Amino acid sequence: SNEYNPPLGIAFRLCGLASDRVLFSRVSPSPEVFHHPKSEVYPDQWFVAIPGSGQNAGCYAIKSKNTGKVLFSRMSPDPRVGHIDGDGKYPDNWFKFEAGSGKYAGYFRLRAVASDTVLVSRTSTGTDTQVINYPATSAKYDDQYFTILFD
Numbered sequence: 178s179n180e181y182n183p184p185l186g187i188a189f190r191l192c193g194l195a196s197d198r199v200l201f202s203r204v205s206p207s208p209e210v211f212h213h214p215k216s217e218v219y220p221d222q223w224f225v226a227i228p229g230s231g232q233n234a235g236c237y238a239i240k241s242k243n244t245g246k247v248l249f250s251r252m253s254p255d256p257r258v259g260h261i262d263g264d265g266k267y268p269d270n271w272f273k274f275e276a277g278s279g280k281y282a283g284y285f286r287l288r289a290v291a292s293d294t295v296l297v298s299r300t301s302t303g304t305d306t307q308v309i310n311y312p313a314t315s316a317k318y319d320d321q322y323f324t325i326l327f328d
């Protein structure tokens with residue numbers, strides 16, 4: 178239940194509900210993977226969805242149009258959230274977009290099934306831990322919800 182399907186063949190930004198910031202992937206400067214206020218649109222904020230197959234049917238890899246890298250989410254090693262080359266070669270590259278309901282209609286969590294984690298974008302901690310992950314089979318918070326933007 179609760180599968181969300183992003184559009185294919187069009188780039189999008191991923192904006193956090195709690196943070197009003199969009200994810201990004203760049204090779205420089207550091208940090209390479211972080212988030213940015215949504216009012217400022219930059220080339221590192223654009224991603225496409227790569228459909229999965231087999232046990233990953235209904236999941237997607239999140240591929241940067243800016244670096245070519247896909248996002249990952251894992252419990253260890255550090256860093257727990259980042260990016261890596263390819264088109265989803267590793268299990269922790271495969272996300273179920275887990276559809277929200279109620280106040281979260283329109284939004285989804287980004288659940289890395291293989292690591293049992295969800296992505297987080299928040300402003301309630303210092304910058305070193307504003308973009309991170311959290312166990313997926315645990316409490317839900319607004320900072321785990323994202324939506325797709327085309328501007």
Ligand SMILES: OC[C@H]1O[C@@H](O[C@H]2[C@H](O)[C@@H](O)[C@@H](O)O[C@@H]2CO)[C@H](O)[C@@H](O)[C@H]1O
Pocket residue numbers: 201203207208211212213219221222
């Ligand atoms: O889309 C991300 C933009 O980030 C801007 O740099 C940020 C940086 O990420 C942050 O760590 C801090 O230093 O503030 C910077 C300025 O807002 C880049 O300037 C911009 O080009 C984008 O990469």
Ligand SMILES: OC[C@H]1O[C@@H](O[C@H]2[C@H](O)[C@@H](O)[C@@H](O)O[C@@H]2CO)[C@H](O)[C@@H](O)[C@H]1O
Pocket residue numbers: 249251256259260261267269270
């Ligand atoms: O999908 C990500 C994979 O990352 C691999 O670790 C990388 C690490 O992220 C990077 O910083 C550098 O140290 O190279 C490592 C090896 O490619 C993990 O080994 C793999 O299991 C995935 O998590």
Ligand SMILES: OC[C@H]1O[C@@H](O[C@H]2[C@H](O)[C@@H](O)[C@@H](O)O[C@@H]2CO)[C@H](O)[C@@H](O)[C@H]1O
Pocket residue numbers: 297299301306309310311318320321
């Ligand atoms: O949705 C993420 C939640 O994170 C919780 O904070 C964690 C934090 O991420 C971790 O680094 C460590 O400090 O443990 C904290 C408590 O589990 C927040 O409590 C919650 O509000 C969300 O932000």
